[PDB]
Amino acid sequence: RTLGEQWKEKLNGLSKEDFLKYRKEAITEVDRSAARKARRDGNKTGGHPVSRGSAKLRWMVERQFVKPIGKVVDLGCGRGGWSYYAATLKGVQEVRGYTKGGPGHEEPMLMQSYGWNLVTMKSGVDVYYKPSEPCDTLFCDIGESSSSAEVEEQRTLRILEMVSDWLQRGPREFCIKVLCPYMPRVMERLEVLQRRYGGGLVRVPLSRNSNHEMYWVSGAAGNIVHAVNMTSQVLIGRMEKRTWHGPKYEEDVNLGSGTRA
């Protein structure tokens, strides 16, 4: 069993009450207060991200794990956190987001953050059946967690099948969620894909400990398997601390306002 695949068994053996304490222990979390007011009051201009995803992407872009440029395609865009953040960035010219939508799946939110005129999101789109289109930057943030690691595995491999046909079109900047990176079939697929399109895996500290998500990003490199194990070790280390402490809070990204040419 991989170290992740021990962390999962452990995770599942936790009481509802220990679960709650653990999921946010020592993680980075952002101050979303003002964002749900804007949300209540429909303030589309306050600069408040529509979701937690904006901060996660910003963590990876600021460290040059991905450098969005040209036309961005955002698969699984949900409310649009990644799309609106990308729209603020200088290299970016056009952002095309796609998301399933429907009941129980997030609908895109219309906002007037900086570069919003550059954003087009289409809900009602199941990306597993959408044909690929040219792009310079590929995002994908899809992966429904699950107590079963085999379910998470099949979900992950299906995503990594779908993404390959987009990467075949040339974008050299990408950022793709890997929900279940500790399963062997997923590690094997990533090495194959890494041989073909490069990049490597990074653990965003804003992720909750209740999931092992990692992001295959074009600006990382190095051994896929060991990067996975290193994060596995962190998550296990946090399950075994005796004094809990809570998350480390930080301010959210301000996405500003206004149109871009």
Ligand SMILES: Nc1ncnc2c1ncn2[C@@H]1O[C@H](C[C@@H](N)CC[C@H](N)C(=O)O)[C@@H](O)[C@H]1O
């Ligand atoms: N087959 C699918 N096709 C399109 N969207 C999907 C599909 N499966 C799941 N999704 C959506 O993918 C989105 C995943 C979210 N984590 C995206 C959040 C987004 N990155 C943000 O920052 O706001 C969910 O909103 C799903 O509804």
